[PDB]
Amino acid sequence: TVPWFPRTIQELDRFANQILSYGAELDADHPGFKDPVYRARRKQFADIAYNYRHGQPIPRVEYMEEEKKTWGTVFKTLKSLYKTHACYEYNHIFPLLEKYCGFHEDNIPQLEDVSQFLQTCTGFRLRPVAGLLSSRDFLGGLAFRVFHCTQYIRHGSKPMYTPEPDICHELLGHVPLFSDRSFAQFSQEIGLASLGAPDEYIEKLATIYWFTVEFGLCKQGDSIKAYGAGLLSSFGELQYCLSEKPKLLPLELEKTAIQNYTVTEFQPLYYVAESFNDAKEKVRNFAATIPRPFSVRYDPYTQRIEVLDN
Ligand SMILES: [Fe+3]
């Protein structure tokens, strides 16, 4: 029997709240563990995500001075690297995010504004998420060009460190690449490959996602640049990934999909994409090997998945 998957964009409501309910901020080693204000603030953001339904505006939040200071620290330190280390697509859109979305060191952008901006760029939209979704549910959202996005910020005691996605990672790591048509098409292809895929292939797609969307490098003319969100939001790893230390290999999905990795240190190995169009075609070819008794395609006119039957 085939795992259930949403067939309409509104059906993303169904499992959007099936998160790991006991979140990272409850761990004794979390930077915010002993801060009860931070704990309540995290619960406040989770409640926003829990009550959100597709089609609604994403609720705006008045960020506190301490949160804006944390954002400013992350923003200013990372911004120094982007001109030289980030791919062209990143640097092309960043001044527009500063101008139209309020990307500035003294202001945390509101998700509703960012979502409207992405919709104009590529039709991608944001949906606030309370905590950790399953890979199946997170990847499935990409088939609809929906990015499940955190709204909370890391604890201010350790501005350069986060054990989890937070809004700085989403906005400075992910959002600029979702503004690019070819990247949007590539990430959507991963999402479409996931719909109804067996659990074993979801984990393979999640590994492909790790080595592309999160830690990918790409060719850029005769050079190599970072496009992975986990690199673009990590001051230390963004500098390391283009140094002589790591191993680089060409993106090759039969190898990439089974490559092991850890989440706690810098990656020892990165995969280099020829282009986002080429990576998209590779994902499409890999998806043809997933045992599914059907094929899928997104109809953006009606925002529904069309399911044929092989
Ligand atoms: Fe991420």
Short mmCIF file of C-alpha atoms and ligand atoms in Angstrom, two decimals:
data_model
loop_
_atom_site.label_atom_id
_atom_site.label_comp_id
_atom_site.label_asym_id
_atom_site.label_seq_id
_atom_site.Cartn_x
_atom_site.Cartn_y
_atom_site.Cartn_z
CA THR A 1 0.00 0.00 0.00
CA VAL A 2 1.23 3.49 -0.97
CA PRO A 3 1.90 6.04 1.81
CA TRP A 4 -0.65 8.83 1.87
CA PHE A 5 0.44 12.11 0.34
CA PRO A 6 -1.34 15.45 -0.15
CA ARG A 7 -2.99 15.97 -3.51
CA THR A 8 -3.93 19.63 -2.98
CA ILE A 9 -1.95 22.48 -1.49
CA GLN A 10 -4.55 22.85 1.26
CA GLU A 11 -3.98 19.22 2.31
CA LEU A 12 -0.57 20.30 3.61
CA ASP A 13 -2.66 21.34 6.65
CA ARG A 14 -3.13 17.65 7.47
CA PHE A 15 0.33 16.73 8.75
CA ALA A 16 1.79 20.24 9.12
CA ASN A 17 1.37 19.90 12.90
CA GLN A 18 2.86 16.39 13.16
CA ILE A 19 6.11 17.65 14.56
CA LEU A 20 8.36 16.34 17.27
CA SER A 21 6.28 17.91 20.07
CA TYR A 22 9.09 17.83 22.67
CA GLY A 23 11.47 20.25 21.03
CA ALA A 24 15.16 21.03 21.17
CA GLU A 25 14.72 23.91 23.63
CA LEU A 26 13.81 21.36 26.32
CA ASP A 27 17.26 19.72 26.18
CA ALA A 28 19.62 20.43 29.06
CA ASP A 29 22.43 21.41 26.68
CA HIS A 30 20.32 23.83 24.64
CA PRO A 31 21.67 27.41 24.88
CA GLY A 32 18.21 28.51 26.07
CA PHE A 33 17.44 25.62 28.43
CA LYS A 34 17.65 27.62 31.68
CA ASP A 35 15.82 30.67 30.26
CA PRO A 36 12.07 30.41 31.01
CA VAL A 37 11.32 33.52 28.92
CA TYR A 38 12.95 31.82 25.94
CA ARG A 39 11.00 28.63 26.66
CA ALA A 40 7.69 30.52 26.63
CA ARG A 41 8.72 32.43 23.52
CA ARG A 42 9.37 29.14 21.73
CA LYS A 43 5.93 27.89 22.78
CA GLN A 44 4.40 31.12 21.48
CA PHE A 45 5.94 30.57 18.04
CA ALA A 46 4.87 26.92 18.07
CA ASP A 47 1.28 27.98 18.76
CA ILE A 48 1.33 30.35 15.78
CA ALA A 49 2.42 27.48 13.54
CA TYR A 50 -0.10 25.08 15.08
CA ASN A 51 -3.00 27.45 14.39
CA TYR A 52 -1.84 28.41 10.90
CA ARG A 53 -3.92 27.18 7.95
CA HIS A 54 -3.03 27.37 4.26
CA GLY A 55 -4.16 30.55 2.55
CA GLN A 56 -3.99 32.67 5.72
CA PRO A 57 -1.50 35.51 6.11
CA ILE A 58 1.37 34.44 8.32
CA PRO A 59 0.92 36.29 11.64
CA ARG A 60 3.39 39.11 12.23
CA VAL A 61 5.37 39.08 15.47
CA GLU A 62 6.92 42.01 17.32
CA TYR A 63 10.45 40.76 17.93
CA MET A 64 12.12 41.75 21.17
CA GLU A 65 15.23 43.94 21.31
CA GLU A 66 17.30 40.94 22.43
CA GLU A 67 16.10 38.91 19.42
CA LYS A 68 16.87 41.76 17.02
CA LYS A 69 20.37 42.03 18.51
CA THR A 70 20.94 38.32 17.92
CA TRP A 71 19.69 38.60 14.35
CA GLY A 72 21.91 41.64 13.77
CA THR A 73 24.98 39.78 14.98
CA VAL A 74 24.31 36.81 12.69
CA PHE A 75 23.39 39.08 9.76
CA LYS A 76 26.45 41.32 10.01
CA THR A 77 28.95 38.50 10.46
CA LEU A 78 27.57 36.34 7.63
CA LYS A 79 27.04 39.25 5.24
CA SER A 80 30.81 39.85 5.11
CA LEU A 81 31.24 36.50 3.28
CA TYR A 82 28.48 36.47 0.70
CA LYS A 83 30.04 38.58 -2.08
CA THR A 84 33.00 36.20 -2.33
CA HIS A 85 31.57 32.84 -1.15
CA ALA A 86 27.89 32.70 -2.16
CA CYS A 87 26.72 31.81 -5.64
CA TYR A 88 25.60 34.46 -8.13
CA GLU A 89 21.92 33.67 -7.57
CA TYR A 90 22.34 34.53 -3.89
CA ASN A 91 24.14 37.81 -4.51
CA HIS A 92 21.71 38.76 -7.28
CA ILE A 93 18.67 38.67 -4.99
CA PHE A 94 20.14 39.81 -1.67
CA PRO A 95 19.92 43.59 -2.42
CA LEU A 96 16.26 43.12 -3.34
CA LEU A 97 15.64 41.35 -0.02
CA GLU A 98 17.29 44.27 1.77
CA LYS A 99 15.23 46.79 -0.20
CA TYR A 100 11.78 45.15 -0.25
CA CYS A 101 11.78 42.65 2.65
CA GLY A 102 13.59 44.58 5.37
CA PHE A 103 16.72 42.41 5.49
CA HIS A 104 18.80 44.71 7.71
CA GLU A 105 20.85 44.26 10.85
CA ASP A 106 18.32 46.07 13.05
CA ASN A 107 15.17 44.38 11.72
CA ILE A 108 14.01 40.75 11.61
CA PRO A 109 11.95 40.26 8.42
CA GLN A 110 8.36 39.11 8.77
CA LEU A 111 7.54 35.78 7.14
CA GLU A 112 4.43 37.16 5.46
CA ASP A 113 6.52 39.76 3.63
CA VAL A 114 9.17 37.20 2.66
CA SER A 115 6.52 34.74 1.47
CA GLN A 116 4.90 37.40 -0.75
CA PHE A 117 8.35 38.24 -2.14
CA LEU A 118 9.11 34.60 -2.97
CA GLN A 119 5.68 34.19 -4.54
CA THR A 120 6.53 37.01 -6.98
CA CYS A 121 9.94 35.46 -7.75
CA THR A 122 9.08 31.78 -8.29
CA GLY A 123 5.72 31.05 -6.70
CA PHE A 124 7.40 29.60 -3.63
CA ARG A 125 5.57 30.38 -0.41
CA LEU A 126 6.37 29.94 3.27
CA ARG A 127 4.37 28.18 5.92
CA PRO A 128 5.37 28.56 9.60
CA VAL A 129 6.39 25.32 11.26
CA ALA A 130 6.57 24.67 15.00
CA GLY A 131 9.39 22.14 15.06
CA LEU A 132 10.81 19.07 13.33
CA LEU A 133 8.68 17.58 10.57
CA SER A 134 9.29 14.14 9.14
CA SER A 135 11.37 14.10 5.97
CA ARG A 136 8.34 12.80 4.10
CA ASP A 137 6.19 15.75 5.18
CA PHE A 138 8.85 18.43 4.72
CA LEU A 139 9.92 17.18 1.29
CA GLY A 140 6.30 16.76 0.20
CA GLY A 141 5.73 20.47 0.73
CA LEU A 142 8.39 21.24 -1.87
CA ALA A 143 6.27 19.52 -4.55
CA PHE A 144 3.83 22.45 -4.10
CA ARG A 145 6.64 25.02 -3.85
CA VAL A 146 5.86 25.33 -0.14
CA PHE A 147 8.78 25.75 2.26
CA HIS A 148 8.01 24.93 5.90
CA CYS A 149 9.82 27.75 7.72
CA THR A 150 10.67 28.43 11.37
CA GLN A 151 9.74 31.78 12.89
CA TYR A 152 11.66 31.61 16.19
CA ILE A 153 15.26 32.73 16.69
CA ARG A 154 18.19 31.07 18.41
CA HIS A 155 19.01 32.00 22.00
CA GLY A 156 20.97 35.22 22.33
CA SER A 157 23.71 33.80 24.58
CA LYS A 158 25.32 32.01 21.60
CA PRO A 159 24.53 34.05 18.48
CA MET A 160 26.96 32.11 16.27
CA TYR A 161 25.59 28.71 17.25
CA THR A 162 22.31 26.92 16.79
CA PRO A 163 21.56 23.19 17.24
CA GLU A 164 18.51 23.49 14.99
CA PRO A 165 17.02 25.53 12.17
CA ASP A 166 15.97 28.98 13.28
CA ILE A 167 14.77 32.06 11.42
CA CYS A 168 18.33 33.23 10.67
CA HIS A 169 19.04 29.92 8.90
CA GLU A 170 15.74 30.09 7.01
CA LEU A 171 16.06 33.69 5.86
CA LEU A 172 19.79 33.93 5.23
CA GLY A 173 20.34 30.34 4.12
CA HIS A 174 17.24 29.11 2.30
CA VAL A 175 15.15 32.08 1.12
CA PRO A 176 17.61 33.66 -1.37
CA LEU A 177 17.95 30.42 -3.35
CA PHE A 178 14.18 29.83 -3.45
CA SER A 179 14.02 33.19 -5.29
CA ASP A 180 15.80 31.59 -8.28
CA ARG A 181 13.65 29.83 -10.89
CA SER A 182 16.11 27.04 -11.67
CA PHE A 183 16.70 26.32 -7.98
CA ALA A 184 12.96 26.38 -7.30
CA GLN A 185 12.41 23.85 -10.09
CA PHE A 186 15.20 21.65 -8.73
CA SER A 187 13.89 21.64 -5.15
CA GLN A 188 10.37 20.97 -6.38
CA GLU A 189 11.69 17.92 -8.25
CA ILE A 190 12.94 16.48 -4.95
CA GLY A 191 9.50 17.10 -3.49
CA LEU A 192 7.74 15.42 -6.41
CA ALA A 193 10.07 12.41 -6.14
CA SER A 194 9.06 12.02 -2.50
CA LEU A 195 5.30 11.77 -3.01
CA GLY A 196 4.25 8.25 -2.06
CA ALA A 197 7.83 6.99 -2.08
CA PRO A 198 8.72 4.10 0.25
CA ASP A 199 10.39 5.08 3.52
CA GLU A 200 13.76 3.78 2.32
CA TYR A 201 13.65 6.17 -0.65
CA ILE A 202 12.51 9.09 1.50
CA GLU A 203 15.76 8.65 3.44
CA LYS A 204 17.70 8.58 0.15
CA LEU A 205 15.96 11.77 -0.99
CA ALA A 206 16.67 13.35 2.40
CA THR A 207 20.36 12.57 1.89
CA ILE A 208 20.28 14.08 -1.60
CA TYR A 209 18.62 17.13 -0.01
CA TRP A 210 21.39 17.31 2.60
CA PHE A 211 24.11 17.34 -0.04
CA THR A 212 22.36 19.87 -2.28
CA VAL A 213 19.80 22.19 -0.66
CA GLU A 214 21.64 22.19 2.67
CA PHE A 215 25.36 21.70 1.89
CA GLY A 216 25.63 21.95 -1.89
CA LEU A 217 28.38 23.64 -3.86
CA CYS A 218 27.90 24.56 -7.50
CA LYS A 219 30.02 25.34 -10.50
CA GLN A 220 29.92 28.99 -11.55
CA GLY A 221 31.79 29.50 -14.79
CA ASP A 222 35.30 28.32 -13.92
CA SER A 223 34.79 28.74 -10.16
CA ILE A 224 32.93 26.98 -7.33
CA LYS A 225 30.50 28.71 -4.95
CA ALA A 226 28.20 27.76 -2.07
CA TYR A 227 24.46 27.45 -2.48
CA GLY A 228 23.57 25.13 0.42
CA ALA A 229 21.54 26.83 3.16
CA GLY A 230 23.53 25.15 5.92
CA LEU A 231 26.71 26.63 4.48
CA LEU A 232 25.21 30.06 3.83
CA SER A 233 24.06 30.34 7.45
CA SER A 234 27.32 29.03 9.02
CA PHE A 235 30.11 31.61 9.28
CA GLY A 236 32.78 29.00 9.93
CA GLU A 237 31.68 26.36 7.46
CA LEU A 238 31.03 28.81 4.61
CA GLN A 239 34.71 29.75 4.73
CA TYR A 240 35.89 26.15 5.16
CA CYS A 241 33.85 24.65 2.30
CA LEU A 242 35.75 26.62 -0.37
CA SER A 243 39.18 25.95 1.19
CA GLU A 244 41.60 23.11 0.41
CA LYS A 245 40.52 21.03 3.41
CA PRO A 246 37.30 19.20 2.33
CA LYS A 247 36.98 16.63 -0.42
CA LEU A 248 34.86 17.66 -3.40
CA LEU A 249 33.13 15.19 -5.72
CA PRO A 250 30.76 15.65 -8.66
CA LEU A 251 27.09 15.31 -7.81
CA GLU A 252 26.15 11.73 -8.78
CA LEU A 253 22.92 10.65 -7.18
CA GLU A 254 23.47 6.88 -7.00
CA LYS A 255 26.49 7.68 -4.80
CA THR A 256 25.22 10.85 -3.12
CA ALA A 257 21.95 9.23 -2.03
CA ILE A 258 23.73 6.62 0.13
CA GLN A 259 26.62 8.74 1.42
CA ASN A 260 26.82 8.98 5.19
CA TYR A 261 27.13 12.27 7.03
CA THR A 262 26.93 13.72 10.51
CA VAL A 263 25.21 16.93 11.58
CA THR A 264 27.60 18.02 14.34
CA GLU A 265 30.92 18.91 12.62
CA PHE A 266 31.91 20.50 9.32
CA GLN A 267 31.26 18.20 6.38
CA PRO A 268 34.39 16.32 5.25
CA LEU A 269 32.92 15.91 1.76
CA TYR A 270 30.81 18.10 -0.53
CA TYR A 271 29.14 17.33 -3.86
CA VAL A 272 29.44 19.88 -6.67
CA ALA A 273 26.45 20.50 -8.91
CA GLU A 274 27.10 21.43 -12.55
CA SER A 275 24.02 23.69 -12.46
CA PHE A 276 20.60 23.61 -10.87
CA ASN A 277 19.10 22.52 -14.20
CA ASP A 278 21.51 19.60 -14.34
CA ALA A 279 20.82 18.64 -10.73
CA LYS A 280 17.09 18.78 -11.50
CA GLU A 281 17.48 16.39 -14.43
CA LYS A 282 19.52 14.06 -12.22
CA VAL A 283 16.76 14.07 -9.58
CA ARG A 284 14.17 13.34 -12.28
CA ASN A 285 16.25 10.38 -13.47
CA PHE A 286 16.70 9.15 -9.89
CA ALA A 287 12.95 9.48 -9.26
CA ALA A 288 12.30 7.08 -12.15
CA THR A 289 14.05 4.38 -10.08
CA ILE A 290 11.74 4.85 -7.05
CA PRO A 291 9.17 2.02 -6.96
CA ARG A 292 5.87 3.84 -7.25
CA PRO A 293 2.88 2.46 -9.19
CA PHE A 294 2.16 5.93 -10.56
CA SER A 295 3.70 9.17 -11.75
CA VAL A 296 3.00 12.65 -10.38
CA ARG A 297 3.10 16.22 -11.61
CA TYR A 298 2.12 19.53 -10.04
CA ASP A 299 -0.47 21.66 -11.78
CA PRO A 300 0.25 25.23 -10.63
CA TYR A 301 -2.98 26.46 -12.23
CA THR A 302 -5.13 24.49 -9.77
CA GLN A 303 -2.49 23.81 -7.09
CA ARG A 304 -3.18 20.07 -7.25
CA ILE A 305 -1.02 17.01 -7.85
CA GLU A 306 -2.04 15.04 -10.93
CA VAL A 307 -1.53 11.31 -10.34
CA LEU A 308 -1.32 9.10 -13.45
CA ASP A 309 -0.86 5.33 -13.13
CA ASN A 310 2.19 3.85 -14.92
FE FE B 1 17.60 24.09 6.38
#
